[PDB]
Amino acid sequence: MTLDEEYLDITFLTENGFVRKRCPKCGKHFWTADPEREICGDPPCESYSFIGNPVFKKPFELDEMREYYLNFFERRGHGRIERYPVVARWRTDIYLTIASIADFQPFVTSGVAPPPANPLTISQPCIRLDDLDSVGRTGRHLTLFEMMAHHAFNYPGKEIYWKNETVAYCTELLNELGVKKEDIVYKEEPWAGGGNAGPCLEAIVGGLEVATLVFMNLEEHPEGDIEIKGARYRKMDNYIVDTGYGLERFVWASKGTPTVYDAIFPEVVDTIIDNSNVSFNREDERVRRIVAESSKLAGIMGELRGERLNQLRKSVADTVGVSVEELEGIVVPLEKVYSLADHTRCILFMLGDGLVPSNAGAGYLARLMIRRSLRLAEELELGLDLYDLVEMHKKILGFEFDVPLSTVQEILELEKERYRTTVSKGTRLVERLVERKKKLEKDDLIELYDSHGIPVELAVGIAAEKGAEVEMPKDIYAELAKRHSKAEKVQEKKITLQNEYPATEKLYYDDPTLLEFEAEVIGVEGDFVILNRSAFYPESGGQDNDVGYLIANGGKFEVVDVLEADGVVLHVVKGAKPEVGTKVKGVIDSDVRWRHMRHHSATHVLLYSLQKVLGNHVWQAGARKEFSKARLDVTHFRRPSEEEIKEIEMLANREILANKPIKWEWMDRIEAERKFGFRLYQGGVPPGRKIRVVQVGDDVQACGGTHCRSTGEIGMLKILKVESIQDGVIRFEFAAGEA
Numbered sequence: 001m002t003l004d005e006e007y008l009d010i011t012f013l014t015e016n017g018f019v020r021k022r023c024p025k026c027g028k029h030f031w032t033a034d035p036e037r038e039i040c041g042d043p044p045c046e047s048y049s050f051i052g053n054p055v056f057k058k059p060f061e062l063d064e065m066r067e068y069y070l071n072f073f074e075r076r077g078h079g080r081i082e083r084y085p086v087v088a089r090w091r092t093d094i095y096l097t098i099a100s101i102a103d104f105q106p107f108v109t110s111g112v113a114p115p116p117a118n119p120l121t122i123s124q125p126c127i128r129l130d131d132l133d134s135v136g137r138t139g140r141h142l143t144l145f146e147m148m149a150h151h152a153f154n155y156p157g158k159e160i161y162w163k164n165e166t167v168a169y170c171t172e173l174l175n176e177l178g179v180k181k182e183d184i185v186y187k188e189e190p191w192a193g194g195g196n197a198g199p200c201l202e203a204i205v206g207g208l209e210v211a212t213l214v215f216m217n218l219e220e221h222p223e224g225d226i227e228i229k230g231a232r233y234r235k236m237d238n239y240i241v242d243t244g245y246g247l248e249r250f251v252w253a254s255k256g257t258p259t260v261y262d263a264i265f266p267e268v269v270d271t272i273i274d275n276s277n278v279s280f281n282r283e284d285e286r287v288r289r290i291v292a293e294s295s296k297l298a299g300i301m302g303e304l305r306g307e308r309l310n311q312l313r314k315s316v317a318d319t320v321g322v323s324v325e326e327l328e329g330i331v332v333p334l335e336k337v338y339s340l341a342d343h344t345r346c347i348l349f350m351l352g353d354g355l356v357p358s359n360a361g362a363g364y365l366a367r368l369m370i371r372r373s374l375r376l377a378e379e380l381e382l383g384l385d386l387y388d389l390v391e392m393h394k395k396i397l398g399f400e401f402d403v404p405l406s407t408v409q410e411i412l413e414l415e416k417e418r419y420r421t422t423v424s425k426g427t428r429l430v431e432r433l434v435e436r437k438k439k440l441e442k443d444d445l446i447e448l449y450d451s452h453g454i455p456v457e458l459a460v461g462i463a464a465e466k467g468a469e470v471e472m473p474k475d476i477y478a479e480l481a482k483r484h485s486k487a488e489k490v491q492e493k494k495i496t497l498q499n500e501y502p503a504t505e506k507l508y509y510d511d512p513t514l515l516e517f518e519a520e521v522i523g524v525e526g527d528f529v530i531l532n533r534s535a536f537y538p539e540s541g542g543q544d545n546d547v548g549y550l551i552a553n554g555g556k557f558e559v560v561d562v563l564e565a566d567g568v569v570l571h572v573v574k575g576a577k578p579e580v581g582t583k584v585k586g587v588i589d590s591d592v593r594w595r596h597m598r599h600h601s602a603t604h605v606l607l608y609s610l611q612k613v614l615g616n617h618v619w620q621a622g623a624r625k626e627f628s629k630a631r632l633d634v635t636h637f638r639r640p641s642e643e644e645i646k647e648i649e650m651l652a653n654r655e656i657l658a659n660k661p662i663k664w665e666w667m668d669r670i671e672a673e674r675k676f677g678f679r680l681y682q683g684g685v686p687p688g689r690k691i692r693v694v695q696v697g698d699d700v701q702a703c704g705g706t707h708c709r710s711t712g713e714i715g716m717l718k719i720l721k722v723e724s725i726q727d728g729v730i731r732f733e734f735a736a737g738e739a
């Protein structure tokens, strides 16, 4: 069934007065229930029509509309669920939450795990950096926004509800708010993201897309069949209702203010204006008349650049009255007030949710937003600090964060200092480059941002200032952001044994002190001795590989190293190798095993201690292997002071001395997450319907390594070295129960 005929499947549209057309007006197919006319749509010929004339019954406040939407589906069988953080801790393919459906990928959407409820409803804060360049310009784009949704997870033979019920829900909700089906347009478009896709319907009312309804039955797979924005997708066994209603867009359509920004955080926009170099006044009836008429077309000209929006700029300039220049005398400065207002809000969530600024990973996106905000504040000569705007955003929303405003302030203050030094020597650097190249390219502006932290608009300006050939590239930030939106490709990859073997019976999971066992050689490839069951720990998780030997009716075969291949453990032996079928008595070296057990259990205690002392922004930076030393990398915005380090060590040793219990047991994912939160994935996200959960004291992680039985077995913990590997990442080298 093709995407096209996938829409001819929905009996709800035709049975409710909706007829399929194709204007063009965007050139796509769409469904309208209005018999009078079709020229309907969003981007090209419609424009906002609700500005000054709300389209909903009453004007809702952010929190009221949020509650109204959630209760609406709760009284319709949907289970309410709390938002997920904006940092995708539960996965490893993407850094931030780009859609509510992203909370449930890839384990729930693939069936590996069950959804929190079914069907469920939620208001998920999302971050869309790809819209960065249109923020503040179209009147409808934000970087951080809440996508309200109702999801239903269907499996073959078990359907909660599909397309008909989905579209019916959106119409009903809309109608109940004050919009008649005659004014609701459903445009057809494909939707993909996070590894899934499907045909979708965009709900367009008043010239604005307020929600999208996706019938998810496609999943990204190598042998893909469907082509959607570069990726290939095949039809899944499961199918999912994937909807998303923009809370801020609903509120905006309920107030009819000039822009979404004036609808969700007017205080912030006003404050910025009142404390900047804005040439106009937010009370003048004149200015108000200009913005209003311009706001109505924002959706059109906002999606254009160059000679494109250049003409519409004239259209509105005429109708309004004054010249194009006067128009730009307000719109352009406002585009920056709206962006700063928006960006400081996105910072609230990135920082409040645990992101630490850096030049790598998700931290890079945090630093990207902050630098751009610092640059916007500078252009406007903001009389307040970014922090002041963030705190304001915080009290308006009323949300609670893992990271307190206190730490947020500290981070923004340090970023501001780094930015100050960057710009100082950065101006000269670009002035110099202009004398040399006289023509700056897209890749030139890229290198300047990444290698010298120079804001693109700061470099494109100085260049033009010196009469240099250069022009603001399309989605340059989205381009920079896109280059840092997902986890890089780690070439540490798979080993494929020439023969298929039954998954090794790992014996170390249950008993960490089982150094001796009995097994049979069920295969031998090169140096890879393979048994049916073994206590030997393969080089993985956080601890290094075991070392020992296999005894049998043949002598003693020393195992020097141990890897693994898709479940089969490999015992590396050279020269005198066992005969496939021999029965052996494996003996693991006690010292090597205990050393790793202590240090690995210490890693947990240390991680727990680091968070308690430094703050909830502390998260394991990663374990990019090299086990020469016992090390732990974490996200922290500066070097720990000597007293903090002293305090980290002290707290860990009090935990060890307390000799708390260390436990482990296989647990279903949903059960684990519900009980321990996403702090469960600090060391990575493992696959499986059931994950091994380890509890070292009060720290809880999905871990597959061998640990001590109680924290007292770790021995004293001594921090031997604290180093700043890279901005936002600090390395702790330590010893546990030894030198």
Ligand SMILES: C[C@H](N)C(=O)NS(=O)(=O)OC[C@H]1O[C@@H](n2cnc3c(N)ncnc32)[C@H](O)[C@@H]1O
Pocket (backbone or CB within 6 Å): 098, 099, 100, 101, 128, 131, 140, 141, 142, 143, 145, 146, 147, 191, 193, 209, 210, 211, 212, 213, 214, 242, 243, 244, 245, 246, 247, 248, 249
């Ligand atoms: C359901 C599908 N996964 C999806 O995400 N559809 S969507 O990309 O269109 O997003 C759903 C809704 O969130 C809101 N939204 C999307 N991006 C936005 C942005 N950058 N700023 C403000 N609102 C946005 C709009 O109402 C949009 O219709």
Ligand SMILES: [Zn+2]
Pocket (backbone or CB within 6 Å): 451, 452
């Ligand atoms: Zn350089």
Ligand SMILES: [Zn+2]
Pocket (backbone or CB within 6 Å): 542, 600, 601, 604, 694, 703, 704, 705, 706, 707
């Ligand atoms: Zn562990």
